Amino acid sequence: YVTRTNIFYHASSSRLLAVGHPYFSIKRANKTVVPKVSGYQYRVFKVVLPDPNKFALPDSSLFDPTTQRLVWACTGLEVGRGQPLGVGVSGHPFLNKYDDVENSGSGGNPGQDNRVNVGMDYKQTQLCMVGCAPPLGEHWGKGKQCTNTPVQAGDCPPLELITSVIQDGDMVDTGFGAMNFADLQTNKSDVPIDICGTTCKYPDYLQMAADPYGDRLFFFLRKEQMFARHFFNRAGEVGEPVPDTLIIKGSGNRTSVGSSIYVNTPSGSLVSSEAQLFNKPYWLQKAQGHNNGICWGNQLFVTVVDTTRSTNMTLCASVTTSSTYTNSDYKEYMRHVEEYDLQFIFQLCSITLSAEVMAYIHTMNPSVLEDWNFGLSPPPNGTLEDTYRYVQSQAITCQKPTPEKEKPDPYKNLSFWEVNLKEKFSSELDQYPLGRKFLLQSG
Amino acid sequence: DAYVTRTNIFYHASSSRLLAVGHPYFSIKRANKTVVPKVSGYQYRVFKVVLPDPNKFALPDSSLFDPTTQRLVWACTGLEVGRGQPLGVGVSGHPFLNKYDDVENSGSGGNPGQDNRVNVGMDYKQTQLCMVGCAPPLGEHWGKGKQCTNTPVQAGDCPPLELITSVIQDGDMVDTGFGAMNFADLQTNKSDVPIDICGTTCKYPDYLQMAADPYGDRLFFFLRKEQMFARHFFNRAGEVGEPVPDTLIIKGSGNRTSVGSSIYVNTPSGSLVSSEAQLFNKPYWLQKAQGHNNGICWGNQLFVTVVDTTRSTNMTLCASVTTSSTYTNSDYKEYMRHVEEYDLQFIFQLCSITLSAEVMAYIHTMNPSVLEDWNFGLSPPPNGTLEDTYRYVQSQAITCQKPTPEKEKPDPYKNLSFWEVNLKEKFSSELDQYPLGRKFLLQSG
Amino acid sequence: FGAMNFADLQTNKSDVPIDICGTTCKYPDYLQMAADPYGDRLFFFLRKEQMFARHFFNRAGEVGEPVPDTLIIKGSGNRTSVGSSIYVNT
C-alpha cells in the first residue's frame, strides 16, 4: 500500500564522546567532575532526524503535495566502532568469602569481617538493537510478602519481574541476575563495587516479539559467551538450615558447621577479532516484522553493548618528586575510553492519504498524530459519555498534584545518551564508502 | 499416514508466560505442604499439552468434511522453545564429602576414615535436548537387590544390578554423568554426591528404546547437544571392600605395608557457553516423520521435554536480622532461590480422517481405551448384556455400596505428577499478525 | 594497555614493561581512512588478533578516590585499612 520511492541518502556523525572513570561516578553536590564511564554500561543512542515533508524536495513530480505525505525509510544500517581491543576488569576490595570450597576440607569459625580484596573478570558480550521505538529491559525486585503473618527482617521474599525501559549508564548482568543489588543485597559488600549501588538488566525478546506494530524490533544479533572459573563461599550466617534428613551429625570439630553457601566465579574466555558483528553493514532488504523500514517521528533507537574493547586505563601523578623510591610518590587515577559512530542509509515513502490509513497510525500510535497534520479537525474522537473532566464548579474535585501531568511524556526521566544529527544528509553517494558498498549490492 | 488427507487449515497457539522460582537444593515448607518447592536448573522438564476437540468448534465450511462418517484431529507442524533468561550456570556441592585427598598432585598419602568430611562444591556436565511425542517418554536408571539366591548374605556384599526402564516425572534431576541409579539405594553413606542428588534419583533416556516401538508416540523430533571435560581427581574414605589382588604388585616395608587408596574419584567439569550452538527460537519443520506417527496428538494431547543448563544460574541475596552494628560475621542470614522461564509457541494443522472398519480396528490397536471419547463408536450388541440382569439380583442393602463400581481408568497415570499447561483457548485462524506465522511463508515460499 | 604517551601519564616509570616505559603506543583506526574520499591511505585491509586474561594484579602507592561512604561498609580495627582498587588485567 506504500509508495516505494527512488532516491537514497546518508547521514553520519564524526565522533561520540565517552571517556572517564570505569568504577563509579565521583560528583560533588555542587557539580559533577566525571561520570561513571564504563564499558559494561548499556549504550543506548537516539538520533534526531528531520522530516521529509519539512525538507523541501525539488524532484516532487511523482506526487501531489496535498493528497500525499512523506516519510523516510531506513534501509542501510551500519555501526561504527574503532577502539583497540582488550579486556576490562572490576571487583570488590572487601568480599564476603570463607575460602576456595574446591580444595579445602573444612572451614574456620566465622568471626568478624573476612572481607578481602578479590577482583574478577566478566563475560564476552556483543549485541545490537535497532528501531523507532525504545526497548524494554526486564529486571527484578523483592516481592511484597502478603499480610498473613508479620515478617521479621532477615527473610526470603519472593520476587516481582519488573518491565522497564532501558536507560544508559546501567550495566549488563554477568550471570548474576537482573535483580536489585540495591534492594535485595543489603550489605553493599557481596557483589562487586561496580554494580552494588544499582541493578542490572536484560532484554526479554519474546515479549519483545509480542508486538503488532513492528516498530520496536526488526533486526537483532547477539554473541555473548562465558564460562565459570572458581568456586568460593560467602561470609555470614545462613537463614535456611539444611535438613537433617540427608546429612549426618558428626563428632568433634565436625559438629561445627561448615559452609553451605557456595559462590561461583564468572570468567571470560579468549577474545575473537573475526567474530565481531561490528562494521559489517546490514540492510532491511526484507523485513521480519511489521515495520517495512517505516520508522516514525524521524527517530531512531540503537543499543549496542560490548565487552571486547573494555580495557581501563592506569595513570598516576607525582606528589613530592622524590629521589629515593617511596610509596608516597604517586596518587592513582583511573579512566576508561569508549568511542563509536553511527552510519545510516535511507529511502523515502510517500504515504497515500485517506482517513482509513489515518486511522491506521492511531491504531499504531496516537502521540505522533500531534504533528502528523492531515488537517487537525476531523479525527472525530467524540462519542457519548457522562462526564469526567469538564464540569468544574469544583466542590468535590480538588487540589491535585499528580494525576494527569507527569504521565504524557514517558521518556523525560528516562536519562540516556543523545545524538543530534538533523543536517547531515547527502544526495549523491559515490562520495561515501558504505553506500558504495551498497552500490555493488544494488548493482 | 497415506490414509488421511492433508487439509488446508492452519492455526496458532501461544502460552504467554510461566513464572517459576524456588530453592535449588531441597524444598522449603512447613510440616504440612509446599508453597515454595525445590526448583533448580537440572531437573527434568515433563509437560502436558492439552488441545480441545476440533469437531466442537464451528469450522467454517461443513461440506468438505462429514461428521457422521469421520472425526478429524489436530496435527503438528512446527514448534519451538522460547527460552528467555540471561545466560549463566549456578553450581552446588555437598558440605560433607567422602574423600581421602587429591590424587593428582599427591603431596602425601592418607590413612583412612576418622571422620574428616569435606566441603567441596563443583559444577556439572552440560546438556541441551528437545523431545516430543503424543505419549510421555520412558527413561532409565539402575536397581539393586535380587538374584538367583543360592547363597546367604554377609555384612556388605556385592549386589548385581538391574536396569529400570521407567517413566520420567518432572523434578527428577538430570545426571552430571555419574550414574542413573538410586542414590538412596546404592549410596548408603548419604554424603558422597551433591546435596540434591543424595536422596533422589538421576535418570537418563534410552533413544534406541525410543526407536523400539515403530509407531512414534514417544518420538518425532530428536535433537541434542552436550559437552564434557573432567578437571581433577579424588578419593573416597572408608574401607577397601573388595581388595586389589597383590599377585602382580610387589609390596614394600616401612609405611608401605599399609594399603593406599584403591578407590579413585573423578571431578567432572563444564566448558563455556556457545550461544550460537543453542537450538531455541529456531523454527523447525518436518514434512516427513520417523515413526508411523506423522505428528498426531493421539489423545488431543502432547508431551514436550526440554532441559536447560545455559540459564542454570543460582541466586543470592543478603539480609541482616540485626538492625545495624559494627560489621562481624554474625550479622546477615542468607537465602537462595533459582529463577526459571519457559514458553511455547505452537503452530498446527487440522487433519481429517476417514472412518472405515480397519480404521476403527487400528484405533483399538493403537490405544483401545480412547475410542470411548469418540462418539460414533456404538456396540449394537450390549456389552453389559444383562449378565447381572441389569442389577436386580436382589440388592439386599446393596445401595450403600452399589456405586462402588463408579468408573475405572479415567487417568492412566494417577500417581505420576508433573507441571503442565492449559491450551484449550489460544487459537486463531490468520496467524500472520502473530510472531513466526510470517515465517510460515518463508518455508512454504 | 592503552594508546598513550605512557612516560608522560606515568611518572613512576615502573608500572609497565620495558618497551613501553618511555615509548608511546599507537593503534591504527579504520574510519578516518574510511572517511577519506580518495583512498590514498586505504584500498584493502584485514586484521586478526587473539587475547585472554591470565592473572589479576595490583599497584602500590597513594590510594585513590574511594566510594562516597555508603557503598562501603566500614571495617573494624585491622579491617579499617582500605587499599588498591587498581585492577591490573594481565
Residue numbers in the entry:
A (entry chain E): 26 to 468
B (entry chain D): 24 to 468
C (entry chain F): 201 to 290
Please quote the authors directly:
Human papillomavirus type 6 (HPV6) is the major etiologic agent of genital warts and recurrent respiratory papillomatosis. L1 can interact with cellular receptors, such as heparan sulfate proteoglycans (HSPGs) or laminin-332 on the cell surface to drive primary viral attachment to host cells. The 55∼60-nm diameter HPV capsid is composed of 72 L1 protein pentamers, each consisting of five copies of L1, and an uncertain number of L2 proteins. Crystal structures of L1 pentamers (HPV11, -16, -18, and -35) have illustrated that the HPV L1 monomer forms a canonical, eight-stranded-barrel (BIDG-CHEF) linked by six highly variable loops (BC, CD, DE, EF, FG, and HI).
To identify the neutralization sites on the HPV6 capsid, we first prepared the HPV6 PsV alone according to our previous protocol followed by vitrificaton and subsequent cryo-EM structure reconstruction. The PsV displayed as homogeneous particles in the view of low-dose cryo-EM images. We finally resolved the structure at a resolution of 5.5 Å, as determined by the gold-standard Fourier shell correlation (FSC), with a cutoff threshold of 0.143. Like previous overall structures of HPV particles, the HPV6 capsid displayed a T = 7d icosahedral structure, with a diameter of 58 nm, and the capsomers exhibited a pronounced star-shaped morphology. Twelve of the pentamers lie on the icosahedral 5-fold axes (pentavalent capsomers), while the other 60 pentamers are positioned at the pseudo 6-fold axes (hexavalent capsomers). The pentamer of HPV6 was easily identifiable, and “suspended bridges” (comprising the C-terminal arm of L1 proteins) connecting neighboring pentamers were conspicuous in the density map. In the structure, the HPV6L1 monomer exihibited well-resolved α-helix and β-sheet core regions and interpretable loop regions. Overall, the asymmetric unit of the HPV6 model had a very similar core region to that of HPV16, with a root mean square deviation [RMSD] of 1.95 Å for all C-α atoms of L1. However, there were prominent differences in the surface loops and suspended bridges in the structural alignment, believed to be associated with genotype specificity. Cryo-EM structures of the HPV6 pseudovirus (PsV) and its immune complexes revealed three distinct binding modalities – full-occupation-bound to capsid, top-center-bound-, and top-rim-bound to pentamers – and illustrated a structural atlas for three classes of antibody-bound footprints that are located at center-distal ring, center, and center-proximal ring of pentamer surface for 5D3, 17D5, and 15F7, respectively.
